[PDB]
């Protein structure tokens, strides 16, 4: 009963997170982040990057109910950006474009959340997370 009301809120959160992710993934600038890095082409990617992340994996994690707060989701967005900056050199413009897109993907995600997510709803999500940890 308590659990069922929690479950409605979390469903509303996932709908929102899916909507945000759809907007990021359909933006052409972020196409390179919409699928895992091809570790066969980018043969040194796993040597350098210990936790790969991308928007299709984020979508999977939403559907698996891994995110109980927007901040949990934003941590994975942040990881996408952090990975891109750790991996891509900063000398040629073709590399710089990827780093620029990574930082812009991060800023966009945070800006959409800050602009659109209801702060009271966010706090309720955080309470549901905390409740489940402690029950």
């Amino acid at each position: 009963p308590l659990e069922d009301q929690e479950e409605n809120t979390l469903r509303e959160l996932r709908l929102f997170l899916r909507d945000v992710t759809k907007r990021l993934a359909t933006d052409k600038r972020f196409n390179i982040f919409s699928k895992p890095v091809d570790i066969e082409e980018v043969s040194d990617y796993l040597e350098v990057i210990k936790e790969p992340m991308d928007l299709s994996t984020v979508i999977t994690k939403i559907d698996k109910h891994n995110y109980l707060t927007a901040k949990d989701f934003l941590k994975d967005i942040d990881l996408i950006c952090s990975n891109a900056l750790e991996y891509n050199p900063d000398k040629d413009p073709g590399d710089k474009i990827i780093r620029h897109r990574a930082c812009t993907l991060k800023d966009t995600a945070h800006a959409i959340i800050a602009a659109e997510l209801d702060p009271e709803f966010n706090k309720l999500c955080e309470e549901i997370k905390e409740a489940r940890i402690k029950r």
Binding site: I32, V37, E41, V42, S43, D44, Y45, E47, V48, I49, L85, E86, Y87, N88, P89, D90, K91, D92, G94, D95, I98, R99
Partner: peptide, 12 residues
């Protein structure tokens, strides 16, 4: 940062 070979060019 920038530790990897890169996504472009001949060696990736």
């Amino acid at each position: 940062g920038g530790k990897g070979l890169g996504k472009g060019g001949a060696k990736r």
